[PDB]
Amino acid sequence: STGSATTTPIDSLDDAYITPVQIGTPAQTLNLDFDTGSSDLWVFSSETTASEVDGQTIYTPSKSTTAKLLSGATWSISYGDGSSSSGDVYTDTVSVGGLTVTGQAVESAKKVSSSFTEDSTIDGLLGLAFSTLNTVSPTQQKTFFDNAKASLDSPVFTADLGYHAPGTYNFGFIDTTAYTGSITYTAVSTKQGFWEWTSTGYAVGSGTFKSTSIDGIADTGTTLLYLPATVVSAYWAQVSGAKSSSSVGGYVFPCSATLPSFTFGVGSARIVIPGDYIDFGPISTGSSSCFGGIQSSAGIGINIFGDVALKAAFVVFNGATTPTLGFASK
Ligand code: NA
């Protein structure tokens, strides 16, 4: 089997991407944030504290003929941005892009933090990191990908995120029409439960490539590119008037600037992030200070190849017995 679903930016900045997901019988379609940095499929629901729901579509298990309470199971998750959610668990039928899993754990939120409530466009998360990170207690649950894997034509999914445009998540196949050149594969460590890999270095604009190992994670659920402070300083030093602002929470730059590209290495291959991808617009409405898309990972404890980086590539998440990542230009 295979699946193929379009993923759509939630706003004009590509802050996140939503993908429609069918849950239950008859189908209830919710727009979920596919997150390769976490391992819980959780949804706004008929159980979510009413004051914490503001515009989201909710899953109502009582209206699904295939829903079953997973008795005694609870979940609670905290993300890198400080957001959180928790609740109880149902099993139900879940379909993505025509690919169906029966018996998927659907984590029903009883509580969500303010950042979730305030984002009316995201109805929940669908985690695609390794199932070792799933938070369900006392019986850990599998991700949608891990439950689908054995049925897929190939044990893979691909992320093809758009720049200010829709893109695609495919399950079970490589679309050889979706990228240019060849795919360069690189080793993955699953030790922390992430799609963790080592970039071979970077370049700023037309500058020389610096060969250096940068361990980080491929995380579709993180907007920005978070790299070591040395690398990030070298990038923003090429932008007149850029500075790190403790008041704003990162590097800002004059909105009048033209940003340089950023290149990262994948083995001997190179992925180029256009300068435009690194502009996250005014820090507040009408400001002439703009927020940068490359930020320091210092204090986060890991480097994160978030959407800024991933949307410059066609990315293969290879879940074979030895997992690997692949990157191609597009
Ligand atoms: Na922000």
UniProtKB/Swiss-Prot annotation:
Enzyme Commission code: 3.4.23.22
Residues annotated as the enzyme's active site: 35, 199
Protein's GO biological process: proteolysis
Catalysed reaction, written as an equation: Hydrolysis of proteins with specificity similar to that of pepsin A, prefers hydrophobic residues at P1 and P1', but does not cleave 14-Ala-|-Leu-15 in the B chain of insulin or Z-Glu-Tyr. Clots milk
Coiled coil ranges: none
Enzyme class: hydrolase
GO MF, one example: aspartic-type endopeptidase activity
Domain of life of the source: Eukaryota
Keyword field contains Disulfide bond: yes
Assigned protein family: Belongs to the peptidase A1 family.
Protein name: Endothiapepsin
Organism of derivation: Cryphonectria parasitica
